A paper describes a structure:
While some archaea produce only one type of filament, the archaeal model species Sulfolobus acidocaldarius generates four. These include rotary swimming propellers analogous to bacterial flagella (archaella), pili for twitching motility (Aap), adhesive fibres (threads), and filaments facilitating homologous recombination upon UV stress (UV pili). Here, we use cryo-electron microscopy to describe the structure of the S. acidocaldarius archaellum at 2.0 Å resolution, and update the structures of the thread and the Aap pilus at 2.7 Å and 2.6 Å resolution, respectively. We define distinct N-glycan patterns in the three filaments and identify a putative O-glycosylation site in the thread.
A deletion mutant MW039 (Δagl3), lacking the sulfoquinovose synthase Agl3 generates a trisaccharide N-glycan, missing the sulfoquinovose, one mannose and one glucose molecule. To investigate this, we cultivated the Δagl3 mutant. Moreover, we found that archaella extending from Δagl3 cells still supercoil. Next, we purified archaella and Aap from this mutant and solved their structures by cryoEM. In the maps of the mutant archaellum and Aap, the glycans were clearly altered. The densities for the sulfoqiunovose, the terminal glucose and one mannose were missing. However, comparing the protein structures of the archaella and Aap with and without glycan truncation revealed no significant differences. These findings demonstrate that the motility-reducing effect of the glycan truncation is not due to structural changes in the archaella or Aap. Interestingly however, only the O4-linked α-mannose was missing from the N-glycan trees of the Δagl3 filaments, while the O6-linked α-mannose was still present. However, S. acidocaldarius Δagl3 mutants were virtually non-motile, indicating that glycosylation is important for archaellum driven motility in S. acidocaldarius.
Residue numbers in the entry:
A (entry chain A), C (entry chain D): 61 to 304
B (entry chain H), D (entry chain K), E (entry chain G), F (entry chain E): 12 to 60
G (entry chain E): 208 to 256
The structure:
């Protein structure tokens, strides 16, 4: 795998007391061959060595497994009387293949919230580490959400800004397709695909922002060389900051 | 026999070369990203004043 | 790919409360080899890191796929009694090849409105994110157009200015040929071609203008190095402004 | 065998060089555009008064 | 016998190495000419304006 | 008999090849890690100032 | 041995100190951007006297 985008880091800017997520993009190197990215076989490690943080595997989920019909029209917004079905997985056709992708990390997050809630509902997963809500009033009835890590993001629906609050139980990573991915259902990144990797921090690693520190991420699939990503992080300069 | 033992040295030498391939590709990905970061910091050092 | 023109940015000048589009031109670097720009394989990302906007893939459509006969004489203006067929894709011949291009982003937008409406009509696409009309009276009957992002542009027909209103559902990018493109139908930019890239903002990213902010765009084809474009944007100074 | 293992080191070293090529071209496109922007801002700084 | 079978593995391994030789020389001739062409286009890109 | 004694030379030559396999793989793992470490120290030497 | 003097202000009063130096020596101390107290490491973006 090659790093095939910038590494983006999000924090509670400007206050910089708390850390939200990292996002980056990967693709198979030099277009030569496909890479298995199944979260059962692959590991993603995360280390901030200066502060003694070292996680040997944070990779839990992939939307590469997920067909558009499993996520589109399955989360919805109540704008007053009106109820709007969201489209989250976009799709296009070439040579009789349907390509699938998520246009941004926000639609990927909502598609994951749905997918993991549906896997909990199906008894396949014990608890989702991610919970996403628009209504904050709910939180008083769910005291476990009080102490875990929370960040917010906005999407637009019927031209209206909808804020979502994402509650994160533990530090975890997920992957989702960004382009060149016709193999929906498979967890395989084919040569000339582009895959988003997103790390959401839990209340442990979130506790204070990375500054004057080296962060290393390593993706190790079951075949082929691992991709090792390292940044020395200066003070973060915006709501999102480009760290590498 | 001439091949059986010769087949043992082929298996082993493939694995040995694959181990160098694994290390060289990983460490190339590492160093090229250190270069990317350095190039960015070099521009930032020339622009910021 | 190389950036082979200035980066143009359009806003609701002088009021600067709302953001319309970005336009820029790309070509294969140093004339060495061709680049696949199919929107199934390629991604275009857009990030305004300061405000936390990060879109992993906005690229949806290309007029490189489109033959002149698919767009010429297929949109028309009713000037009173008279009805005028528009020519949108211009063409010229060299060495037995027909070159195809759009002279401006306005004819490219109209050619795209037609193409996407025709793909919706053919059931190949669920909805067009772009809708273009001259008649604003229609909007009262189509309330979804009330809240999404709108900008206007003029073309001249029978020496008369015709204003078109472009309604944009979500932030998306498209590409179209500008010169040196004989490969109509292919989505491939050959060496020594020039390709227009245009980003139209949806009601999310449109919400307020870029000022005192860094905007990064990255085009990542399925083979070869991505093109990363970055501008720090000062206050925009006209209906269109040169940002890079 | 001498070639089979030798063919493993060629594949890997090609990929390793292609990764540097990918990074160097991308980062050259980046820095040259930072230069373009800087040159523009330098002229604007000399002209505007 | 020790040589007869051993002579079968020598013939085959020669052919196998000769096949890599054939491919590597051809592909070196190819890539070096792609380099020649690229160097020319790079100079033309720097000179033409 | 022709096979019984011939079976003694096959067992022994397998073990002999397996011993080279064992050594070559171990020493490849060693040297490739010395290379990894060296590449890291080379980058550190170029970056630190 | 070598002697020089310097003044500091304490309760708004000038206090002169006399520094006696046995041999030529150098020392370092943090000036800014140094959170790594205890380490002897100057991190990137620190300033060391
Ligand atoms: C938008 O999202 C809704 C919630 O996920 C979804 O409702 C679910 O619909 C399925 C079966 O779909 C049929 O019935 C729905 C109304 O419920 C119709 O909108 C649709 O056209 C089909 O006739 C149903 O099994 C499930 O219980 C519903 N869930 C809820 C919470 O009501 C909508 O179908 C979906 N699409 C539209 C067009 O509204
Ligand atoms: C993320 O997954 C959660 C499950 O892990 C899910 O919570 C459940 O919500 C359903 C009702 O969902 C509908 O209504 C909400 C508003 O109440 C809409 O935002 C949503 O789009 C649906 O139309 C509820 O029955 C159930 O008790 C909840 N389960 C738990 C464990 O709390 C979240 O709704 C989901 N996030 C989003 C944005 O859909
Ligand atoms: C993180 O782990 C918590 C403890 O292991 C767990 O708290 C329990 O939650 C259950 C069910 O409530 C939640 O179910 C989903 C997870 O499937 C949540 O996303 C959502 O917020 C629901 O409200 C609850 O019955 C139980 O009492 C809680 N127990 C404890 C000890 O806290 C969280 O659910 C889990 N995930 C998140 C997102 O916080
Ligand atoms: C978010 O959850 C709230 C409680 O969990 C819920 O409020 C409850 O709903 C009714 C009152 O109607 C509300 O409806 C509108 C639209 O949702 C609100 O904007 C308005 O302020 C009303 O409060 C009531 O039975 C119940 O007591 C309310 N509980 C509380 C604590 O207010 C909200 O309706 C729900 N959605 C939104 C958008 O806020
Ligand atoms: C994301 O969505 C939020 C709610 O969907 C919205 O906040 C609402 O807007 C106003 C208050 O103004 C906000 O504006 C600035 C810039 O957006 C914020 O940084 C600031 O903190 C203010 O909150 C208010 O009418 C409404 O009650 C707000 N709702 C909530 C829940 O806060 C945000 O403006 C919008 N954008 C951003 C960048 O956060
Ligand atoms: C200008 O644009 C018109 C609308 O796209 C187009 O009309 C369409 O024509 C096709 C077939 O073309 C024949 O018939 C038209 C009249 O309809 C003649 O102008 C033309 O010379 C051909 O004889 C027809 O299938 C389609 O239904 C028509 N669409 C509409 C809305 O009427 C015109 O053909 C085109 N060119 C000229 C010269 O007017
Ligand atoms: C462009 O608009 C002109 C008016 O601004 C118009 O000229 C006038 O046309 C009318 C009607 O005659 C023309 O009808 C068709 C147009 O489709 C022509 O092909 C035909 O040759 C007729 O001339 C006429 O009464 C009036 O004298 C004209 N005005 C002047 C000042 O000469 C043009 O016809 C119109 N062109 C097109 C192609 O729509
Ligand atoms: C952009 O594509 C739209 C479809 O996505 C299309 O709307 C359709 O318009 C047709 C009629 O088109 C003719 O008439 C209009 C004026 O009414 C002319 O501007 C146009 O050139 C054509 O001659 C209508 O039958 C259909 O119901 C509309 N479909 C939808 C979904 O509204 C727009 O016309 C098109 N924009 C342009 C400038 O052509
Ligand atoms: C953006 O998304 C909207 C919701 O997904 C969608 O609104 C629906 O529009 C359909 C059909 O009307 C339009 O069809 C084309 C798109 O193919 C538009 O360009 C044009 O304006 C037509 O009027 C309508 O039947 C349906 O009720 C609407 N539903 C909702 C929930 O809004 C828009 O069409 C789509 N595109 C644009 C340009 O706004
Ligand atoms: C844009 O759409 C309008 C309604 O969607 C339509 O007006 C309707 O058309 C007739 C009246 O004739 C009009 O025709 C001319 C030329 O189009 C207009 O300039 C003139 O002002 C007339 O209004 C009528 O049946 C209907 O009630 C009208 N509806 C409304 C709301 O006015 C326009 O004709 C059409 N085109 C233009 C150029 O405005
Ligand atoms: C998006 O929000 C709009 C308001 O900001 C809303 O327009 C208003 O709608 C009301 C009710 O009428 C619509 O109800 C459904 C929506 O589900 C439509 O399909 C239907 O065509 C009705 O028009 C209306 O009283 C009011 O006039 C509208 N406002 C304006 C300025 O026209 C939209 O309906 C809503 N869209 C969706 C899909 O939720
Ligand atoms: C683009 O086309 C518009 C309509 O096709 C045209 O507006 C018409 O022109 C006059 C009003 O004068 C306008 O002039 C200035 C400069 O062009 C505008 O900035 C200003 O806002 C005025 O609107 C009027 O007769 C007619 O009703 C107008 N029609 C509409 C729909 O506004 C514009 O002048 C033309 N050019 C530009 C730069 O917008
Ligand atoms: C540094 O501190 C000295 C003592 O703490 C102080 O000297 C005392 O000041 C006066 C004498 O005047 C001095 O003033 C000038 C300028 O400061 C000196 O350069 C000059 O040599 C004089 O000594 C006296 O009352 C007292 O006894 C002095 N004490 C000693 C020990 O000399 C210095 O003035 C002060 N500043 C400098 C620049 O040396």
């Amino acid at each position: 795998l090659s790093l095939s985008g910038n590494v983006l880091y999000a924090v509670n800017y400007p206050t910089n007391t708390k850390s939200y997520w990292m996002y980056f993009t990967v693709s198979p190197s030099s277009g030569v061959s496909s890479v298995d990215l199944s979260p059962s076989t692959t590991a993603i490690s995360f280390t901030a060595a200066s502060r003694g943080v070292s996680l040997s595997n944070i990779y839990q989920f992939s939307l590469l497994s997920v067909l558009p019909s499993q996520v589109n029209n399955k989360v919805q917004v109540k704008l007053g009387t009106s109820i709007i079905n969201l489209t989250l997985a976009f799709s296009s056709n070439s040579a009789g293949q349907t390509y699938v992708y998520y246009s941004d990390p926000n639609y990927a997050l909502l598609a994951l919230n749905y997918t993991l809630g549906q896997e909990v509902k199906g008894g396949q997963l014990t608890s989702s580490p991610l919970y996403i809500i628009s209504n904050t009033s709910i939180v008083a009835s769910k005291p476990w959400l009080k102490n875990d890590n929370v960040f917010t993001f906005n999407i637009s629906v019927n031209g209206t800004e909808v804020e979502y609050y994402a509650y994160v139980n533990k530090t975890f990573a997920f992957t989702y397709p960004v382009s060149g991915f016709p193999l929906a259902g498979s967890d395989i990144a084919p040569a000339g695909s582009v895959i988003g990797v997103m790390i959401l921090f839990g209340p442990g690693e979130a506790t204070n922002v990375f500054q004057y520190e080296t962060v290393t991420i390593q993706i190790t699939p079951n075949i082929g060389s691992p991709l090792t990503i390292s940044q020395y992080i200066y003070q973060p300069d915006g709501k999102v900051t480009v760290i590498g | 026999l001439a091949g059986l033992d010769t087949a043992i040295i082929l298996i082993a030498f493939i694995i040995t070369a694959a181990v160098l391939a694994y290390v060289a590709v990983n460490m190339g990905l590492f160093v090229t990203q250190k270069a990317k970061t350095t190039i960015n910091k070099g521009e930032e050092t020339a622009s910021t004043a």
